[PDB]
Amino acid sequence: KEQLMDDSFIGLTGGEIFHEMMLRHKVDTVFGYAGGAILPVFDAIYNSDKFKFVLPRHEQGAGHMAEGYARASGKPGVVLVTSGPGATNVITPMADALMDGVPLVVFSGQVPTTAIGTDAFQEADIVGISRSCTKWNVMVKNVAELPRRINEAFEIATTGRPGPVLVDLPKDVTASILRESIPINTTLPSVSEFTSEAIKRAANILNKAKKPIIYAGAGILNNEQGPKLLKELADKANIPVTTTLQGLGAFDQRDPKSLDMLGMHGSAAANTAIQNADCIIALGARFDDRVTGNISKFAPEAKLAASEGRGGILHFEISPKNINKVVEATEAIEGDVTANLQSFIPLVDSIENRPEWFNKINEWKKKYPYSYQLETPGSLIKPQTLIKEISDQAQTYNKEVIVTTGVGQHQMWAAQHFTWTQPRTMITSGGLGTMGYGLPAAIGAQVAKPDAIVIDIDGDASFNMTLTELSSAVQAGAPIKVCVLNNEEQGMVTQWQSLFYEHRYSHTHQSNPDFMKLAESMNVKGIRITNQQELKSGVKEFLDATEPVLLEVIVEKKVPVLPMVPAGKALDDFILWDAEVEKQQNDLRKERTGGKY
């Protein structure tokens, strides 16, 4: 009994217990912001040398920083904020983390238990508000249960599909002192025959396939061996590989078997290949509606193969909720994709050549490059060209390169035109798609990986959302590299307004600050590229900098991201770039807007 109970926390405040549990969970970084209700915890962590504390300018900043940290490091991102508005300000980052499967542990101060439900000063019902944007949450009601709840939070955040959790900390609980012993288990952190048979059946199906394709996503990144086993499978059975936006970097795009990204703005070669494949191996991807195109018209050849007993969809998925949610799996392989790949690959036959399939694959790649209208004499820099320049120069350094983005056209062009080669190097808001993510995510990733080059490829409207966090990067010592693609428009929305609303640009042009004076005011280096002849040397200065730096690039306006699978269309029913079409579109836009755009 004495062996099962622990007295070592007796005499500590809840805040002190919190501090000790952070250490036991190997937390090396906390992102947060103080306030009245969370003071007992801030007093306990005062001058701690046990972890780095990162102070944002806004709690949304703390949230997205913790996300960037978690995606760069594979560890949970820990957030510590006060009650009321400190807590409600973390709602967008929590919903973001939930949609993108990001392990976030949010600790929010709360008014004393005696004031809850009285419309108290700085009281929000954050447990109610965050229910739908967390995997789980709880309000701690006494200090004796605080260690158990902290263990529970970290365990839930990091198991199954990773995601956000919230633990609410009333001020009287964190100020109270533990007076009683607690179970010692609470003071420390931590293949079915059914699945084994599904794996065997899956292998037998793949061994019949004549047109296989791997559709790989974020889940493969959640194990360090993931990308290795993906390559091992693709190499053994000779299978072309496409990834989602969130799977970018899971497979070496330089490899001949790389089909690049699929989906709404993915390669027409990848989209064509998945529409014609007789066997689809879905590895840690959830068939999102930006990827599938028209669901009823998705993967016709794999559905036919399944019906004829010679292919189908093999779905390696850790969360049962996402199995058979969108598309019917021919075989569902439940659990960690990397673990299940270790069992799968040895049952898979080695294949030397697939001459007709790869003849088709190579023909599609050749006819469907990411084409766009190149610069002409006197024109502005094209945003596609800028991305290529950054990608080509960044790979010259002897350092890891991590990219974060905002949301919009710049995000899609970054996805398309960067060459992705390493896991956890694309850190982008995909499911919720939060403008403003890019800068704080970069700071969080830079803190996780202090020897990495971290580049925030950002849109001007996105950057405007959270640009106050530039001060935070300086104060944290995070030498991030922000590149603002300044088209002076919410380009992704003007793209839709051009295509579907006859060039009626309804409130999609926000005015920008002077980004060079802004950088100066924030004590950040500033570079501005305004013409084609400054692109190369300006990008070099940007990447050579050893301090935080903001690069502004003036780029062409009103240019669409192509290819594009419009809403309602099948994945292989895409719009492609055409020079003459673009020219006509420009003329039509000019006429319709009286020359304003």
Ligand X SMILES: C/C(NCc1cnc(C)nc1N)=C(/S)CCOP(=O)([O-])OP(=O)([O-])O
Q: Could you give the string, one character per residue 103-122, with x where binding to ligand 60G holds by CB under 6 A and - elsewhere?
A: --------xx--x----xxx
Considering CB distances under 5 to 8 angstroms, the limit depending on partner class, which of ligand X, ligand FAD, ligand 60G, none binds residue 85?
Answer: ligand X
Cβ–Cβ under 8 Å, residues 59 and 81 = yes
CA neighbor of 87 nearest in space, from 143, 133, 56, 127:
127
96 binds ligand FAD (CB under 6 A): no
CA neighbor of 266 nearest in space, from 307, 302, 216:
216
Which of 85, 369, 450, 513 is close enough to bind ligand X by CB under 6 A?
A: 85
Which of 13, 29, 89, 497 is close enough to bind ligand X by CB under 6 A?
A: 89
Give, as ranges, the residues between 401 and 440 that touch ligand 60G (CB under 6 A): none
In the three-class reduction of DSSP (H, G, I as helix; E, B as strand; rest coil), residue 63 is classed as helix
- Whether residue 9 lies in the annotated active site: no
Q: Could you give the string, one character per residue 113-142, with x where binding to ligand FAD holds by CB under 6 A and - elsewhere?
A: --------x---------------------
Stretch that binds its own copies, among 92-100, 347-355, 365-373, 442-450 (CB under 8 A): 92-100
- 139 strand-pairing partners: 168
Which of 357, 372, 515, 577 is close enough to bind its own copies by CB under 8 A?
A: 515
487 binds Mg ion (CB under 5 A): yes
27 binds its own copies (CB under 8 A): no
Stretch that binds Mg ion, among 23-31, 180-188, 489-497, 574-582 (CB under 5 A): 489-497
Residue 124 CA to residue 304 CA, distance in Å, equals 53
Q: Write down the catalytic residue from 59, 67, 334, 469.
A: 59
> How does DSSP classify residue 380?
P
Which residues lie below 8 Å from residue 85, measured CB to CB, with a gap of 6+? 59, 122, 124
Which residues lie below 8 Å from residue 556, measured CB to CB, with a gap of 6+? 379, 380, 381, 382, 383, 487
Residue 336 CA to residue 334 CA, distance in Å, equals 7
DSSP assignment of 240-261? -EEE-STTTTSS-TTSTTEEEE
Residue number, 85 or 450, with CB nearest to ligand X = 85
**Has 290 been labeled as part of a binding site?**
yes
> How does DSSP classify residue 268?
H
Give, as ranges, the residues between 303 and 322 that touch its own copies (CB under 8 A): 303-304, 307-308, 320
Walk across the sheet containing 549-554 and list its strands.
426-427, 401-405, 453-459, 481-486, 549-554, 525-529
Considering CB distances under 5 to 8 angstroms, the limit depending on partner class, which of ligand X, its own copies, ligand FAD, none binds residue 518?
Answer: its own copies
Give, as ranges, the residues between 209 and 268 that touch ligand FAD (CB under 6 A): 217-219, 222-223, 244-247, 261-266
**# residues near ligand X by CB under 6 A:** 26
Considering CB distances under 5 to 8 angstroms, the limit depending on partner class, which of ligand X, ligand 60G, ligand FAD, none binds residue 161?
Answer: ligand FAD
The residue with its CB nearest to ligand 60G is 36
Q: Could you give the string, one character per residue 158-177, with x where binding to ligand FAD holds by CB under 6 A and - elsewhere?
A: ---x----------------
Q: Write down the catalytic residue from 5, 50, 121, 224.
A: 121
Residue 108 CA to residue 17 CA, distance in Å, equals 15
Question: Most distant CA pair in the chain: distance in Å?
Answer: 84
347 binds its own copies (CB under 8 A): no
Give, as ranges, the residues between 491 and 510 that touch ligand FAD (CB under 6 A): 492
Rg for the chain (alpha carbons), in Å? 25
Q: How far is the CB of 306 from its own copies (least distance, A)?
A: 8
- Cα 207 to Cα 199, 307, 334: the distances in Å are 12, 16, 20
Number of H helices, E strands in the chain: 23, 20
Which of 139, 143, 221, 407 is close enough to bind ligand X by CB under 6 A?
A: 407
- 10 strand-pairing partners: none
Residue number, 212 or 408, with CB nearest to ligand 60G = 408
Report the 10 Å Cβ neighbour count for 311.
25
Q: Name the H helices within 332-481.
A: 337-344, 355-367, 383-394, 409-417, 438-448, 460-466, 470-476
- Whether residue 540 lies in the annotated active site: no
Q: Write down the catalytic residue from 51, 52, 122, 200.
A: 122
Walk across the sheet containing 136-139 and list its strands.
52-54, 29-32, 77-81, 104-110, 164-170, 136-139
Cβ–Cβ under 8 Å, residues 214 and 230 = yes
- Whether residue 492 lies in the annotated active site: yes
Give contact residues for ligand FAD (rule: CB under 6 A): 100-101, 121, 161, 217-219, 222-223, 244-247, 261-266, 284-286, 288, 290-291, 316-319, 322, 336-337, 407, 411-412, 430-431, 433, 492
Going by the annotation, the residues of the binding site for thiamine diphosphate are 409-410, 433, 435, 461-462, 487, 491-492
Catalytic amino acids?
A: 59, 121-122, 171, 492
Binding residues for Mg(2+): 460, 487, 489
* Residues engaged in binding ligand X (CB under 6 A): 33-35, 82, 85-86, 89, 406-410, 433-435, 459-462, 485, 487, 489-493
